[PDB]
Amino acid sequence: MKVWPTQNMKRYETLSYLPPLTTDQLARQVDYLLNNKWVPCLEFETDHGFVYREHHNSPGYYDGRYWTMWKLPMFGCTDPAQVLNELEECKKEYPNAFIRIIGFDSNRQVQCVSFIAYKPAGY
Amino acid sequence: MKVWPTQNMKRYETLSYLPPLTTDQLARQVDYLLNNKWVPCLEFETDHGFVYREHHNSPGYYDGRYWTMWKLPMFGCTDPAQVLNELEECKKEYPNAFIRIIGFDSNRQVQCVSFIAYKPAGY
Amino acid sequence: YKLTYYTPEYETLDTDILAAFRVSPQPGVPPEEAGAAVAAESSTGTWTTVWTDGLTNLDRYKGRCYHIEPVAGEENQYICYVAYPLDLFEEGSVTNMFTSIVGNVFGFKALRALRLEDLRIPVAYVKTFQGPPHGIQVERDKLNKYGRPLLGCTIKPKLGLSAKNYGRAVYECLRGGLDFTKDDENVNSQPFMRWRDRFLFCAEALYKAQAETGEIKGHYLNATAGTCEDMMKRAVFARELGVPIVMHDYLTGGFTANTTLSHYCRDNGLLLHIHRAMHAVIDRQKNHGMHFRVLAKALRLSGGDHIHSGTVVERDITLGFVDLLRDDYTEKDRSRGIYFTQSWVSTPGVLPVASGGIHVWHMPALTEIFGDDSVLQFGGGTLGHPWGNAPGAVANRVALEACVQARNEGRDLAREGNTIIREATKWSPELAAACEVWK
Amino acid sequence: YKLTYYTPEYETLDTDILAAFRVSPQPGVPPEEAGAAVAAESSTGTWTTVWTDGLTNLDRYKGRCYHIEPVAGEENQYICYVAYPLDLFEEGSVTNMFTSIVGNVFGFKALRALRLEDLRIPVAYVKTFQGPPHGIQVERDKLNKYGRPLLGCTIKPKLGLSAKNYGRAVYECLRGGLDFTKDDENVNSQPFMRWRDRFLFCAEALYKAQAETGEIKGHYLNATAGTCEDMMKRAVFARELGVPIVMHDYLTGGFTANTTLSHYCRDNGLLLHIHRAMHAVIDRQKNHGMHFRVLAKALRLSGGDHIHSGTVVERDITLGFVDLLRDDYTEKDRSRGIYFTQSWVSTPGVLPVASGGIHVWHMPALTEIFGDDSVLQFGGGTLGHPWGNAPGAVANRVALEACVQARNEGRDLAREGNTIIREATKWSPELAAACEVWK
Ligand SMILES: [Mg+2]
Ligand SMILES: [Mg+2]
């Protein structure tokens, strides 16, 4: 009988309860985006990688949902490697950042994907 | 394609997106005040340097807009060097302070200028 | 009744409400008369003619039976199609729509039985309703939850816990990676747990679990009440606590109270979870009542963000009405019990909620069937875990993410579902423990 | 008509409203008759005489054509000057001022066309209006923004983004050094983006960008609505979010709703951005309608903090009405289309907003022409930067500060503007990238 831990157990939504994605597993999740004609984008955050409430308190208001866009969404990306290259460039500039891959469906007109690609050490 | 940084990128309003002003550049900005018959003054802050909200959060209420006056407005100042001398005296007493030059238009009856003259190292 | 109300040559207008009735006439009532009777008795038909009829044009206000087809297999049963003009209906009132169509006809003595299967709600009527307070896209954006089913748990036992003990179970549920916990449909305000106490303790628990995990959490706070005043007091305190989601039992509270709550929720940024308690009284029997798809359509107009859509342990019929809840446009398809092409002119979709008797081994099937825009609700399957609520929750969250990952890689969840779960047991002890207990 | 209403000897009172009309008479209608007809038909002129006229003194209530001058160049066109007594007008009601002066006369058959060019609003009428909720000086003090133009960006596309994706663009715009982002005049509440959703996500984005940069940020939240009740619910939520600035489409909403919102904004500390959507229906043609300067003066009375004043790609006419919006006193100047000396007796000035197809190379010209007390609004010129919104924003902020610095040092923005930008490209890669794309 294990007790689920309380300390240093922050999560990042979809896929963050699995083992960290290998470079191959990451490439297969990016392939799923490209096969559905979703536009991959990267987002990063240095300060708080979780949700909190500083500026307001009313229903459905949270701070910490928007992270910062790395460059632009990768329109007409054909190859997972182009995403994984930007991931490496982002990790190089911000080794202390959380980084997630997001996806835009231009047909449904929404953001449709969000999963963690890199966490700093200790997380 | 460069990504604009998120971290340690606080700004101080007018002129703070330019390179830090040289002594000569500072003197020319003070000359503009004097040529328009605006009264230069110095203002400094040791604690925050940015706007925040502690005491209230209603529309148009922010903390951190007022800094502290260095001495008095320099009425009947004719020479930029006198302002630059006060700047040096202020930096000597508060090396850890942000320091801006402000201007008062006694005809329009408002503050009319506010630009950063000195930041401590790391900013 | 024959000559006025059976109009096989009638071309339906784009403004007409269309109804498909499953009609079981009394022996020796021919279909044409049965169909005319349904139209007449759901609109302008009187038993004796009246002089006041000459003060208007009844042809403008009559229901018209415009098509009849026999039902395969069943003896003496027909689908009758009836057109009702737009002008019959109060704008934005589901109450009036149901009163007009189903208020009178189901007691008519020439019918042995009568079931409403479907309604074509015309786009000019659709635009009179608010619809969902938020709907699927906005909900995902507010909660910051993409690319998977959402995960919920009903707190059990439904009655008998103190408000504090109930909140303890909520915290332990939420912290293990469930998005939502939930009041049972029965939990309103009762002697051993008064609603305001429950709300307060559930708020403490939900905020503790959110601060622990960093993921946004909700608890479906049941605002269902005896009066509109009571319902509103409950929704208002939820607003005051800053919590994201409330709940209503739309059939037992009713459409008048539901539409009031839906408008309040839009105005105050609250998600609305809708429970379909009592649906089986109406929707179970094939020859008498109203199919759930009609109740679902009605809810999408009155408004809610989530609606209970049942377990899947016919599939096609469920997938039929799930599309009716989620999509902007659904084409007639008799194999899925969609009698009419339905447009929603950008009325938001509603999240279907799967519930009842499900556990970790159901997760591949549920993910395959519903897809990402669903809520999967695990009462027993979380609280029955041998290690308690947080491990319960972890087991469900891992099984789900394992399925999502496998699906995204190109695996067939229908064929390899068992294998996907088994693989995840190898690195999740919480899921391994669950998989020993069920199946 | 001639002897009562054409009064060339009349000395204007300090309480009179004076109008300058550009009058295009029907062929063979002499000017003096045209002028009298304009006066008569905008005041007390009756087609048959009536006994009730003897119960009062109509000389007290008549409009008087007191001067006529030909227009140089035009055949058969005149400026007619008309005096209206103070007693005609409801206090504090721009609605009544426009109704009284322009409500009737523009349809008069002896005129082929009619344009209102200017109004002298007397100081006693000025003091009946609140005027801007804050105005230029107060806005600068609240926002802590001195000694340069303010900078904004309209979010594009206007329709099609989800509320979250729209807020994403706002964050990325604001964080790169823009002061303001903005709702398009068309964005009120629509199926894919309901107003309260947009407000909420814009709040999150605005506060993220302010915390990141340490500068005060604003997003013009468009409160324009179908009813006053709806408009107010929107301004109220802006108040609740603590955000600095709302917007109104003052011509399509109208003056009655505008003045309500202006008073609410003064009472709750909200800045008010005013969009002039529909102005060109009225103000475009030289022969017929009302010059923008009249619409501008009206807005300064009803009240707003900002008003769209157009692109500047005649300059003198624009500079004319910009002074009318900002200054306390403007002397008659026919070369700038200022037909009357106007005093404002300390009614605050309104910030003019320049917009349209502008980009970094426009910055020297815009800074030269408008000076510091202006808002420069990019849409394409920020969002179209090859590196995205934040670099877009940085390019614009650097270009502006570079120009401000150069101007303060004594450089001529008219002559050296191109060179000032080129110099800044040497140390700003963000600006260098912009300068390759435009020009
Ligand atoms: Mg239940
Ligand atoms: Mg626009």
Numbering used by the authors:
A (entry chain V), B (entry chain S): 1 to 123
C (entry chain O), D (entry chain L): 20 to 332, 338 to 463
Which sentences from the paper describe this structure?
Ribulose-1,5-bisphosphate carboxylase/oxygenase (RuBisCO) catalyses the addition of CO2 to ribulose 1,5-biphosphate (RuBP), using magnesium as a cofactor, once the enzyme has been activated by the addition of CO2 to a conserved active-site lysine residue to form a carbamate. Lys201L is activated by the addition of CO2 and the labile carbamate form of this residue coordinates an Mg2+ ion that participates in catalytic activity.
Here, we present a room-temperature serial synchrotron crystallography (SSX) structure of SpRub in anticipation of future time-resolved serial crystallography studies of the RuBisCO-catalysed carboxylation of RuBP. SSX data were recorded from microcrystals and yielded an X-ray structure to 2.3 Å resolution, showing excellent electron density of the labile carbamate form of Lys201L in all four molecules of the asymmetric unit. A short loop of residues, 333L–337L, lacked the electron density to be modelled in our structure. Most importantly, we obtained a room-temperature SSX structure of SpRub at 2.3 Å resolution, which showed high agreement with earlier single-crystal structures of this enzyme without any obvious signs of radiation damage.
